[PDB]
Design a protein around this ligand. Structure first.
Ligand SMILES: [Cl-]
Ligand SMILES: [Cl-]
Ligand SMILES: [Cl-]
Ligand SMILES: [Cl-]
Ligand SMILES: [Cl-]
Ligand SMILES: [Cl-]
Ligand SMILES: [Cl-]
Ligand code: NA
Length: 129
């Protein structure tokens, strides 16, 4: 599913992401835009042989099992295909584990390079939340 900006903001708000560990809703929308272009089916293969899955490009080296990333962890306890669902619940629940892990949203390279220190409130401007 390719989400609209406000549609996704509303879904993330309902799943408890607004101010989760201090990150306003605009941070999560900005990250999703630059990670996946708001497409739940996005996959990208890394040089190391790991793959990034879904709206928040969660990586198979640590967070999910795809059956092809040798000596990987599955810290979210989900198949990586669960992250491509039109229901963002599995992605959100896994993202909450990631952002609690010590590096905050710096775990998302596109958030660090394209969202951090920008006016992220602009991503939810105009939305009925
Ligand atoms: Cl947009
Ligand atoms: Cl915000
Ligand atoms: Cl594997
Ligand atoms: Cl594991
Ligand atoms: Cl699994
Ligand atoms: Cl959803
Ligand atoms: Cl933090
Ligand atoms: Na894995």
């Amino acid at each position: 599913k390719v989400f609209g900006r406000c549609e996704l903001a509303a879904a993330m708000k309902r799943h408890g992401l607004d101010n989760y560990r201090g990150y306003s809703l605009g941070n999560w929308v900005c990250a999703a835009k630059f990670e996946s272009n708001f497409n739940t089916q996005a996959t990208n293969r890394n040089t190391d042989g790991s793959t990034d899955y879904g709206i928040l490009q969660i990586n198979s080296r640590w967070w999910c099992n795809d059956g092809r990333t040798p000596g990987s962890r599955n810290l979210c306890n989900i198949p990586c295909s669960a992250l491509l669902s039109s229901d963002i619940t599995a992605s959100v629940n896994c993202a909450k584990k990631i952002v609690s892990d010590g590096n905050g949203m710096n775990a998302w390279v596109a958030w660090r390079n394209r969202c951090k220190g920008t006016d992220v409130q602009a991503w939810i401007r105009g939305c009925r939340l």
